[PDB]
Write a protein that binds this ligand. Structure first.
Ligand code: HEM
Length: 153
C-alpha cells in the first residue's frame, strides 16, 4: 500500500515523463537492451538492432517505449485500482510475447535509472522510493495474473 502522498509523488514525476514520452521511451528501451541484451530477442520486429544509432532511429523501438510509459501512466493514475488495465497486459505479455516477470524487473530498473538521469533535481530518495513501491505493486499484481494464466512466471 502506498499513501496518498506517495501516489502524488509518483504522478508528479510521471507528468514529467509524459511531457516527453518519446524521449523517455527511447531511453528506457535503450537502457534495458544495453543492460540486458537478451530482452531484445523478445521483440521480433526490431531484434535486429545492434548500434545505438540504429536504436535511436528505430520507429518500432520507440513505439514500444512510448506504449510502455503510456500504459504505465494509466495504471499509475489508478493508484492501485488497476485490475482492468493489468488484464490485457498480463494476457499478451504472458501468453503471446512470453515476457518473464524477471524482464519486467529489468524494465523497471531502466525506468528508475532514466527518471534519475533526466530529473535529478526532483527525483530524490523520496520519489524514487515511492516509484519503486508503485512499480513493485504493479509487478506483484501482474505476477499473480501470470500465475492464473499458467505462465511461470
Ligand atoms: C511496464 C512494462 C510493460 C508495459 C506497460 C508494456 C505494454 C505493451 C503494450 C501496450 C503492447 C502492445 C499491445 C500488447 O501486445 O499488449 C506491447 C507489445 C509488445 N511487448 Fe510490452 N510492455 C511492457 C514490458 C515489456 C517487455 C520487457 C518486453 C520484452 C523484454 C515487451 C515485449 C513486447 C513485444 C515483443 C510486443 C509486441 C509488438 C512490439 O514489439 O511492440 N514488453 N507491450
Amino acid at each position: 500500500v502506498l499513501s496518498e502522498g506517495e501516489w502524488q509523488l509518483v504522478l508528479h514525476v510521471w507528468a514529467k515523463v509524459e511531457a516527453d514520452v518519446a524521449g523517455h521511451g527511447q531511453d528506457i528501451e535503450i537502457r534495458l537492451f544495453k543492460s540486458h541484451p537478451e530482452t531484445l530477442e523478445k521483440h521480433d520486429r526490431f531484434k535486429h538492432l545492434k548500434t545505438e544509432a540504429e536504436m535511436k532511429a528505430s520507429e518500432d523501438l520507440k513505439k514500444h517505449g512510448v506504449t510502455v510509459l503510456t500504459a504505465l501512466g494509466a495504471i499509475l493514475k489508478k493508484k492501485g485500482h488497476h485490475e482492468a488495465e493489468l488484464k490485457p497486459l498480463a494476457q499478451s505479455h504472458a501468453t503471446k510475447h512470453k515476457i518473464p516477470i524477471k524482464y519486467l524487473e529489468f524494465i523497471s530498473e531502466a525506468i528508475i535509472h532514466v527518471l534519475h538521469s533526466r530529473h535529478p533535481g526532483d527525483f530524490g530518495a523520496d520519489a524514487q522510493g515511492a516509484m519503486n513501491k508503485a512499480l513493485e505493486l504493479f509487478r506483484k499484481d501482474i505476477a499473480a495474473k501470470y500465475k492464473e494464466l499458467g505462465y511461470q512466471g
